[PDB]
Ligand binder design. Structure first.
Ligand SMILES: *[C@@H]1O[C@H](CO)[C@@H](O)[C@H](O)[C@H]1NC(C)=O
Ligand SMILES: *[C@@H]1O[C@H](CO)[C@@H](O)[C@H](O)[C@H]1NC(C)=O
Ligand SMILES: *[C@@H]1O[C@H](CO)[C@@H](O)[C@H](O)[C@H]1NC(C)=O
Ligand SMILES: *[C@@H]1O[C@H](CO)[C@@H](O)[C@H](O)[C@H]1NC(C)=O
Ligand SMILES: *[C@@H]1O[C@H](CO)[C@@H](O)[C@H](O)[C@H]1NC(C)=O
Lengths: 115, 122, 121
């Protein structure tokens, strides 16, 4: 059976711009700025080799964002800043001052008793 | 239960950090907790040591570890920096100090001996 | 985890061995021996679209290696706040003090404990 796929659109919010990004699922670009993933064919973006945090997930470690003209870019998502701690057999990390933070957490409890 | 009615030990369960206490608030179809943690900052680096031998006898600290004030071996607890002088009531003694690997050298101050020293002066 | 931690190239931990759970840098997909045993002992045109996960197995391995290294080098402190370094032996002492055993029991039986741990691994 000749190839098919799901049609999916990548975009920022309408309160930013109206530029788009077109993603074809599970089939590569030879049958439709062209970029290829394991997810399929992504049209309407630009491959960048800088690592940011993810904005919208796409698949296979690929996320897209709309930054500064201004256009759709995509990249391989990071896992935050690379960091390591100096280790020895005679070192330790001991604090001296502190803060008191408050984090909002929200859990849903009930729903409307429909009948 | 665990975070409003009392103080859970369970880390990573009500907010991020050592859990202190919380406050609940009303919400439509829901609840909103406000957790209060103890997040530390502003650290230095500190040369450490597992124990101290004084007169052949080892010393393990009752709480805390032995810390750095520069190149000296003083002592405080494990989650806030407030160094102390090594006394007997901060440690205890179990065994010879030769099986203990990584041990360092320091004197151990005693509280009783200078109060004893006030007797032998007179 | 808030940040990625990479293990140091120092493998002195008081005798404890973790080269069977830390990744080898030599692999193309950085994974450990036990991870490789795990990933090998787990075995259309009707609308079936198999969406792949957002996080590939390499990324999962990155996250786990970070958690593992933080555990090894920082105790539980990186769970609460910023990571605070510490030797493993003293961390082990900490954890034995948590269960009602004094830390001298460790520091006198350290090699025995390390050998038992390595054997169990
Ligand atoms: C969203 O749109 C409204 C009306 O177009 C505008 O007033 C508002 O500033 C926009 N939000 C942002 C963050 O620009
Ligand atoms: C589409 O199939 C595979 C998968 O990406 C790719 O290697 C191949 O080159 C593509 N087909 C053509 C004709 O380029
Ligand atoms: C992307 O990779 C190419 C080589 O494949 C490199 O020349 C280029 O500088 C990279 N892009 C960025 C923004 O670093
Ligand atoms: C001193 O502390 C800093 C803060 O993390 C650390 O980067 C550095 O390695 C420490 N110095 C030594 C000699 O370990
Ligand atoms: C730490 O390791 C070094 C290896 O260079 C060794 O010389 C030293 O005795 C060790 N110190 C402790 C306290 O384990």
């Amino acid at each position: 059976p000749c190839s098919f796929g799901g049609v999916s659109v990548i975009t920022p919010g309408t309160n930013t711009s109206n530029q788009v990004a077109v993603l074809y699922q599970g089939v590569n670009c030879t049958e439709v700025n062209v970029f290829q993933t394991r997810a399929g064919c992504l049209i309407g973006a630009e491959h960048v080799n800088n690592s940011y945090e993810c904005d919208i997930p796409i698949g296979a470690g690929i996320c897209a964002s709309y930054q500064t003209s201004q256009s759709i870019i995509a990249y391989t998502m990071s896992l935050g800043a690379e960091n390591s701690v100096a280790y020895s057999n005679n070192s330790i990390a001991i604090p001296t001052n502190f803060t008191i933070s408050v984090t909002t957490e929200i859990l849903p409890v009930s729903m409307t008793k429909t009948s | 239960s665990e975070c409003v009615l009392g103080q859970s030990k369970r880390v990573d369960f009500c907010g991020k950090g050592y859990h202190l206490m919380s406050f609940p608030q009303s919400a439509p179809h829901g609840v909103v907790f406000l957790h209060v943690t103890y997040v530390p900052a502003q650290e230095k680096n500190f040369t450490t040591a597992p124990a101290i031998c004084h007169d052949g006898k080892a010393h393990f600290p009752r709480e805390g570890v032995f810390v750095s004030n520069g190149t000296h071996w003083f002592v405080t607890q494990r989650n806030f920096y407030e160094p102390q002088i090594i006394t007997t009531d901060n440690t205890f003694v179990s065994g010879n100090c030769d099986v203990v690997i990584g041990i360092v050298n320091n004197t151990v101050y005693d509280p009783l001996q200078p109060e004893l020293d006030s007797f032998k002066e007179e | 985890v808030k940040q990625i931690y990479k293990t140091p190239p120092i493998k002195d931990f008081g005798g404890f061995n973790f080269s069977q759970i830390l990744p080898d840098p030599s692999k193309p997909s950085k994974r450990s021996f036990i991870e490789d045993l795990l990933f090998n002992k787990v075995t259309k045109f009707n609308g079936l679209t198999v969406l792949p996960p957002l996080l590939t197995d390499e990324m999962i391995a990155q996250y786990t290696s970070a958690l593992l290294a933080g555990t090894i080098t920082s105790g539980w402190t990186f769970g609460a706040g910023a990571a605070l370094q510490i030797p493993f032996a003293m961390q082990m002492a900490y954890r034995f003090n948590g269960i009602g055993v004094t830390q001298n029991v460790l520091y006198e039986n350290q090699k025995l404990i390390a050998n038992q741990f390595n054997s169990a691994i």
